[PDB]
Structure 1
Amino acid sequence: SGFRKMAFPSGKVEGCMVQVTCGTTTLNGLWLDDVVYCPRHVICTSEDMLNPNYEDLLIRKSNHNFLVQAGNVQLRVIGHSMQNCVLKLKVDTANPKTPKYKFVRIQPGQTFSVLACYNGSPSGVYQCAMRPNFTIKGSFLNGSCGSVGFNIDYDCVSFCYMHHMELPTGVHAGTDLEGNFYGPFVDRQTAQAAGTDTTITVNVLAWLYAAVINGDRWFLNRFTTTLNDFNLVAMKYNYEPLTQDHVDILGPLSAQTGIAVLDMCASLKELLQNGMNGRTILGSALLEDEFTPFDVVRQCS
């Protein structure tokens, strides 16, 4: 038994992490096959970030200006192009540690594991979630740009995130592995603000289902509710509106616990209306919303 914030084994991704140095700036790149993916702001300095015509600055850059390093080995760049906000550095030698992988753009609320990297070397791994305002609450210092978020299905490593920016409000923003930013954020240093960070409601119920099968049952209570009326209380406390799909995904969680999805919404409804009375659920004094229903069934498999 036991429940914890778990991240995927990052071993397959560590073998894809390289260092990219373009002029004076340095960050990390994702080495898959014979292509190295890195944020396109590597071709910019601190003054360009104020407002960078990225197409103009790429005109002055050539193949030998991109230094790809994989430990004590230097990769030879023989081609480069700009795909949205990412850089595709074609190299001559393929990555021998390339795993089974795809490029998947995740949805708001889905979770993924992030490998923090600096100078192409992995520093740590933690679990993250795509907040409804299309930001993430990760740990990213300077030089962490190029770090990726991934999911692992048996043998397939599903790359989904790449760090780019840190907003002036403390959170972070980035793109998928195709270069398209998650949300209305641009790779430019300006006054960017994210929306009101609502709570992934389907991820809270899945987390409450994990507390039931682990001992924490003091929040279980003798009330039920309807989907429309629970969404009224959920909308007041800045929660995501629950849909019929979210109810279905918790089906397996409801089938094993024998607690209906609407009965869990009522118990949650009382936690929003009465608080927690100083008590804890699964070692947390607040309601955790960074566990997908699939994250629970995987940890309780």
Structure 2
Amino acid sequence: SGFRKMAFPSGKVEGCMVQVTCGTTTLNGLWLDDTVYCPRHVICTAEDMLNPNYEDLLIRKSNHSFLVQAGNVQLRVIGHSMQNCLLRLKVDTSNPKTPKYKFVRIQPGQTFSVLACYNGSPSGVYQCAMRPNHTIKGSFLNGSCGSVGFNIDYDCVSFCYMHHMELPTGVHAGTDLEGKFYGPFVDRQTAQAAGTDTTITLNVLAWLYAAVINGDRWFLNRFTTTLNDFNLVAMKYNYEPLTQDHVDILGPLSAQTGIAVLDMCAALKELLQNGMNGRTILGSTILEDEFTPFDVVRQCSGVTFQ
């Protein structure tokens, strides 16, 4: 029993982390086979950031402009390209520790583990959700750029995030492993800000199912709601509209607990309207929205505590 924000074991990823220095800038890179991935902003100076032309900055660089360190060993760069907001540095060695991997672009609402790293050495791991406004609530200091987000299936690592910057609200922005930013953000010093965020409705509902699987039913009620009547309440509390697709995804949890989704929706409507009254749900006083339906199934028992 119990319910914790749980990250994937980080070992397959720790063996891919390297250090990347270009001039006086140090950050992290990801070394798979014979390539090292890293934020392109590694090439920039301070003043460069107000106005960088990356094509123009990169043409002025040779292979040997880049020092890549894997643990104590230096890896020699023998090739480079730019792909969107990333550099792809080809090196003399294939990583002996490259795992089975894939690159994926994850969707808002989905979660991933972040391996926070400094100077190519992993310091910590935690679980994040991609917010609706395309930021993550990470924990990052200067030096963390190039740290990566991931999910693991069987023994394949699905890389989904590389960290590039902190916004003024203290939340974090970056790209997929194709160098394409999540969100409207750009790797230049401008007045960009996180857009207004929304609560992830699907995740909240999943988490109420988790609470029921774990043995708590207090928050249920006799009522039901239509999809449409729920959403009018949802909009008022700054929750995402629930869609039929979302209802269908919640099928298996629904089945395991014998609580119809629209009945769970009615319970939620009542929680939003009345509060929790000094009560907790899985040890929380607020409604949690960083656990997907997938996460609940991975973690919780296949057998409900009726």
Whether the TM-score (by the shorter chain) exceeds 0.5 is: yes
CA apart distance, 1:118: 0.2
Structure 1 window deviating more from structure 2 (270-279 vs 19-28): it is 270-279
Q: Deviations over 1:39-96 (max 9, x none)?
A: 0000012221122111111121111111100111000100001000000000010000
For residues 285 and 20 of structure 2, the distance between their equivalents in structure 1, rounded to whole angstroms, comes to: 41
For residues 52 and 193 of structure 2, the distance between their equivalents in structure 1, rounded to whole angstroms, comes to: 19
Structure 1 window deviating more from structure 2 (117-126 vs 219-228): it is 219-228
CA apart distance, 1:197: 0.7
CA apart distance, 1:259: 0.3
| Paired residue total | 301
CA apart distance, 1:193: 1.3
For residues 245 and 92 of structure 1, the distance between their equivalents in structure 2, rounded to whole angstroms, comes to: 47
CA apart distance, 1:199: 0.8
Q: Deviations over 1:124-179 (max 9, x none)?
A: 00000110011111011000000000000001100000000111111111000000
For residues 21 and 182 of structure 1, the distance between their equivalents in structure 2, rounded to whole angstroms, comes to: 25
Q: Which runs of 4+ in 1 moved over 4 A?
A: none
Q: 2:21 corresponds to which residue?
A: 21
Q: Secondary structure at 1:203's aligned position in 2?
A: helix
For residues 294 and 217 of structure 2, the distance between their equivalents in structure 1, rounded to whole angstroms, comes to: 21
Structure 2, unaligned stretches of length 5 or more?
A: 302-306
For residues 288 and 51 of structure 1, the distance between their equivalents in structure 2, rounded to whole angstroms, comes to: 40
Q: 1:133 corresponds to which residue?
A: 133
CA apart distance, 1:19: 0.3
Q: Is contact 2:214–2:300 with CA below 8 Å preserved after alignment?
A: no
Structure 1 window deviating more from structure 2 (31-40 vs 42-51): it is 42-51
Matched, 1:53 2:21: no
For residues 44 and 286 of structure 1, the distance between their equivalents in structure 2, rounded to whole angstroms, comes to: 42
For residues 280 and 146 of structure 1, the distance between their equivalents in structure 2, rounded to whole angstroms, comes to: 37
Q: 2:275 corresponds to which residue?
A: 275
Structure 1 window deviating more from structure 2 (179-188 vs 217-226): it is 217-226
For residues 102 and 268 of structure 1, the distance between their equivalents in structure 2, rounded to whole angstroms, comes to: 37
Structure 1 window deviating more from structure 2 (112-121 vs 165-174): it is 165-174
Q: 2:189 corresponds to which residue?
A: 189
Structure 1 window deviating more from structure 2 (52-61 vs 255-264): it is 52-61
CA apart distance, 1:215: 2.5
Structure 1 window deviating more from structure 2 (188-197 vs 231-240): it is 188-197
Q: Is contact 2:102–2:159 with CA below 8 Å preserved after alignment?
A: yes
Q: Is contact 2:254–2:260 with CA below 8 Å preserved after alignment?
A: yes
% identity of equivalent residues: 96
CA apart distance, 1:217: 2.0
For residues 8 and 189 of structure 2, the distance between their equivalents in structure 1, rounded to whole angstroms, comes to: 32
Q: Secondary structure at 1:253's aligned position in 2?
A: helix
TM-score under structure 2 normalisation?
A: 0.97
Q: Deviations over 1:174-201 (max 9, x none)?
A: 0000000001000112111122110110
For residues 276 and 196 of structure 2, the distance between their equivalents in structure 1, rounded to whole angstroms, comes to: 23
Structure 1 window deviating more from structure 2 (53-62 vs 74-83): it is 53-62
Q: Is contact 2:149–2:160 with CA below 8 Å preserved after alignment?
A: yes
For residues 231 and 243 of structure 2, the distance between their equivalents in structure 1, rounded to whole angstroms, comes to: 9
For residues 56 and 279 of structure 1, the distance between their equivalents in structure 2, rounded to whole angstroms, comes to: 59
TM-score under structure 1 normalisation?
A: 0.99
Q: Secondary structure at 1:64's aligned position in 2?
A: helix
Q: Secondary structure at 2:64's aligned position in 1?
A: coil
For residues 191 and 218 of structure 1, the distance between their equivalents in structure 2, rounded to whole angstroms, comes to: 46
Q: CA RMSD in A?
A: 0.8
CA apart distance, 1:216: 2.6
Q: Is contact 2:34–2:90 with CA below 8 Å preserved after alignment?
A: yes
